[model samples]
Target: ASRLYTLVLVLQPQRVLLGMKKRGFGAGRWNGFGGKVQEGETIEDGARRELQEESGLTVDALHKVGQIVFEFVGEPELMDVHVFCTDSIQGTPVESDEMRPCWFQLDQIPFKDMWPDDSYWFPLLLQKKKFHGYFKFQGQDTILDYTLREVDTV
Candidate 1:
């Protein structure tokens, strides 16, 4: 079965929040905070929970900014990730067992250290545009094929 996940990005006028994954799926990479949606939880709810768990922050609201379907070359299961963005958050970002929180200036994002697919769609997010993307990955650092487009609605 395909897995459902959420990814939340906290935005600021000059910077954005990111976390270095300390373990699990995207270890050693800087990415947004989020994870699997629980059985009865909405995608937004899962995003909120994961952000708080990983970074010790709570967002007041989340804007559905994008959606991406990630397919691995040899894996049977795919990941459908709903992406969210917010400018309002409560509490200071603190490191958790899963992530080390950090802030990056808008022009200094660490894309090379993140999932390859991020380099494609993250620009849209920074531009405050909604988008939809599909990526076929050969492995963690290779994107065999992908499609990305800006959309009026996510």
Candidate 2:
């Protein structure tokens, strides 16, 4: 099955919000907030909901910056990851039961602690450029092959 999901980036002039998942997929990794898109919700709506749930902050406007399709070698599902970004957000980032939120300096993001695919698209994200990509992960850390490029608009 192909499932829709979201990944949100709260980008500020000097920093970006990142979090450690207290459980599940993001558990020990350093990354932005996101998760599976609910059946009845729009892709953008799901992004906002998940971000608030995990970081305790809400964003009203989201830029649809990118999309990356993930294919794990042995898994049956293709995860269609929608990437959203917002410069304007509300509230302090109080960590939720699911995440421990923190800020990373723009040039200091810990890519080593993130999913390998992030290394490919994160630059575009910080530059506010749009993109669409695809990745085939052998398991979790290895990207068997990939494709990524700048897009005018998403």
Candidate 3:
């Protein structure tokens, strides 16, 4: 089985906002804001709440850009990540204990420091393309297998 999760990216024409997660689960990793969905909330609502909590910025709307499943070798818990993006934000990114924020130019996206799966679907999102993906990882730093393609799901 898999647990639903949310990830929101704040993007511009040539820049994107990403944060370094600072604790357990994925400490010291640079990714967008999000976490597991909570009970009694819609997926989109969970996204809004998580993003706001992590970055301290509010969004009026979001684009549903991708859905990804991450599987770890020999691990029973699978993660389903719903990826969203927005260029419209309501406040400055305020740092929190759980997340430290940074903005990068398009070409400078910190893939070397990001989660292994990010390099697979991030570019499609930048083009406003909806996509789906699944990755099997040996652990955290290596992807043993993956499949990703654009989908007309939006």
Candidate 4:
């Protein structure tokens, strides 16, 4: 079965906020804050909830920025992730049970420590462009093949 997930990024003038997953899927890597979209919740609501829960920040508004379908070799399930971004945030980023929040300079994102697919689409995000992407991963760190393109709207 396929699963739906949310990923929210908080952006500043020259930096972006990310969380280091402390456990579960993608543990130890720095990435956006988000998780599964629960039943009956809108994707945007799920994104807001996850961001607050993991990073202790509340976003007044989120821009629906991009989407990605991730397929891992040998796995029966695919992950469809909706990405959101916001520059308006409230509260300090405090570490939670699931994540350790931190900020990175735009050019200093730790892509090598993140999921392999990030390198392909993250630049689009930094460019403030909408995008759609599909990634086939042979393993956690290897991208077997992928396609990413900017879109007029997400």
What lDDT does candidate 2 reach at residue 53? 89
Choose 3 or 4, whichever is better by lDDT: 4
Tens digits of lDDT, candidate 1, 6-102: 9999999999999999998989999899999999998899999999999989877789999999999889989999999999889999999999999
lDDT sort, best first: 4, 1, 3, 2
Instruction: After the best TM-score superposition of candidate 3, give how far the Cα of residue 141 lies from its true spot, in angstroms.
Output: 0.8
Tens digit of lDDT per residue, candidate 3, span 1-154? Answer: 8899998989988799999988977788897998899989999999999888998999999889889999989989899999998998999998988899999999988888888788878878888889999999996888888999899983
Name the 10 consecutive residues with the lowest summed lDDT in model 1: 115-124
Model 1 reaches what TM-score against the true structure? 0.96
RMSD of each: 1.0, 1.1, 1.1, 1.0
Residue runs of model 2 more than 4 Å from their true location after superposition: none
lDDT of each: 0.91, 0.88, 0.89, 0.91
The segments of candidate 4 whose C-alpha lies over 4 angstroms from its true place after superposition are none
How close to the true structure is residue 78 of candidate 1, measured as C-alpha lDDT? 92
lDDT by residue for model 4 over 1-154, one digit each (tens)?
7899999989888999988899998998998989999999999999999998998899888999999999999999899999999998999999999999998999899998998788888888888999999999887888888889999878
